[PDB]
Design a binder for this molecule. Structure first.
Ligand SMILES: CCCCCCCCOCCOCCOCCOCCO
Ligand SMILES: CCCCCCCCOCCOCCOCCOCCO
Ligand SMILES: CCCCCCCCOCCOCCOCCOCCO
Ligand SMILES: CCCCCCCCOCCOCCOCCOCCO
Ligand SMILES: CCCCCCCCOCCOCCOCCOCCO
Length: 364
């Protein structure tokens, strides 16, 4: 019986987040501070029997400040399954080259709309979405979209894309989408994974955007290259990014851009910006400290447009230090410290600390 299949096969978890966030400006008059507690209840039902299985997911968000992020929200999502392909309608949170929901604050950004994931066929995975609302990570209400830096107003985002495995090691991607009445963007990607005794990942990105509808003329191009070398417990990555045209890298305001040099604070997607990144990771497991992690990265950008000049420059340093409790009562309890420093000649200098204490508990 259907209703009961929904429950019998359902799963659920609760996540607790305690979150401290600090922004210190070099213009101290813009210094923000926040201490908050969040709760996230995730409910995923099973599917009703048949060719097309139906189900329902829910996500409950509660946040309050401790000193916006003072709210409660429940988002429903109807779903429909055939073979291994999935359609969702309602509240959405997913990642893709042209649109990615953010979850780096207390509570996640959500979109409203329809998302369709077609199961991998012959090495090919197709995805598509129609979105019509954005709910910023820090707020409870759904609003229409605008574009980062660029502005505009839009009540529809659409995209379709394919990810194709040319071989087991090489994946090619092509996504096309539109933020209605603001911009159109197309993305092509190539990713090579070399697994030896140790690994090298090569990630190439190219995206072009222009205006849509009656929006002011818009021209942007963004090329990215990221090479990530895994060497035992060590990892080093080098990234290169170049933004071109009259306009900066467009994306839905509030969301995450798919730029290889997008980091804790900056996207390095300013007009004409050229940037390079070095990144290091160490996993302390082999050493005997499973659960301890460290990450450090640096990005330097130049060629940024300042009026008719191109002498804008910036750099940002990030450091992540994190520990997950491995055993005992408090098992799965995780603490993470994210520290960022930014300096530029076209924006304000900033130091930022994020401290996140998180605990996840399976209900069933
Ligand atoms: C407050 C009542 C708790 C609800 C428990 C639901 C358990 C359903 O899963 C059964 C498997
Ligand atoms: C500056 C040249 C831009 C480099 C674009 C390479 C993108 C590779 O994707 C290929 C898609 O298949
Ligand atoms: C948490 C502090 C992060 C600072 C980064 C330190 C850089 C670590 O580089 C060490 C790499 O050294 C390679 C080891 O040299 C090979 C010889 O011995 C290897 C066999 O144990
Ligand atoms: C903000 C993270 C601070 C973690 C300090 C590093 C050492 C913690 O691991 C202790 C392992 O012993 C158990
Ligand atoms: C609508 C379901 C929300 C339930 C949230 C709290 C669940 C309480 O614990 C249930 C544990 O039993 C699992 C068997």
């Amino acid at each position: 019986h259907h209703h009961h299949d929904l429950v019998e096969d359902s799963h659920a978890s609760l996540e607790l987040r305690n979150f401290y966030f600090n922004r210190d400006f070099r213009g101290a008059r813009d210094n923000a501070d926040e201490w908050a507690q969040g709760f996230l209840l995730r409910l995923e039902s099973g599917f009703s029997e048949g060719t097309v299985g139906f189900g329902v997911d829910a996500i409950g968000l509660l946040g309050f400040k401790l000193d916006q992020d003072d709210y409660a929200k429940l988002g429903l999502t109807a779903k429909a399954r055939v073979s291994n392909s999935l359609l969702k309608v309602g509240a959405l949170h997913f990642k893709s080259p042209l649109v990615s929901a953010n979850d780096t604050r207390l509570l996640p950004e959500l979109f409203r709309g329809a998302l369709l994931d077609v199961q991998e066929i012959d090495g090919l995975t197709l995805r598509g979405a129609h979105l019509d609302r954005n709910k910023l990570n820090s707020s409870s209400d759904y609003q229409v979209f605008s574009a980062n830096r660029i502005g505009g107003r839009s009540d529809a985002f659409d995209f379709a894309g394919g990810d194709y495995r040319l071989t087991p090691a090489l994946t090619a991607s092509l996504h096309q989408g539109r933020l209605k009445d603001i911009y159109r963007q197309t993305f092509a990607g190539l990713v090579h994974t070399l697994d030896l005794g140790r690994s090298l990942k090569s990630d190439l990105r190219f995206a072009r955007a222009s205006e849509d509808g009656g929006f002011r003329e818009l021209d942007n191009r963004a090329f990215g290259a990221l090479f990530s070398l895994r060497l035992g417990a060590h990892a080093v990555a080098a990234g290169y990014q170049r933004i071109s045209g009259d306009d900066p890298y467009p994306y839905i305001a509030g969301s995450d851009p798919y730029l290889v040099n997008f980091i804790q604070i900056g996207d390095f997607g300013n007009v004409d910006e050229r940037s390079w990144q070095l990144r290091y990771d160490y996993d302390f497991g082999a050493l005997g400290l499973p659960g301890l992690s460290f990450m450090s990265r640096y990005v330097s950008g130049d060629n940024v447009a300042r009026g008719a000049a191109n002498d804008g420059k910036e750099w940002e340093r990030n450091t992540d230090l994190g520990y997950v409790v491995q055993s005992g009562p408090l098992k799965n309890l995780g603490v993470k410290w994210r520290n960022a420093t930014v300096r530029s000649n076209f924006a304000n200098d900033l130091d930022e600390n994020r401290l996140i204490l998180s605990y996840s508990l399976a209900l069933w």
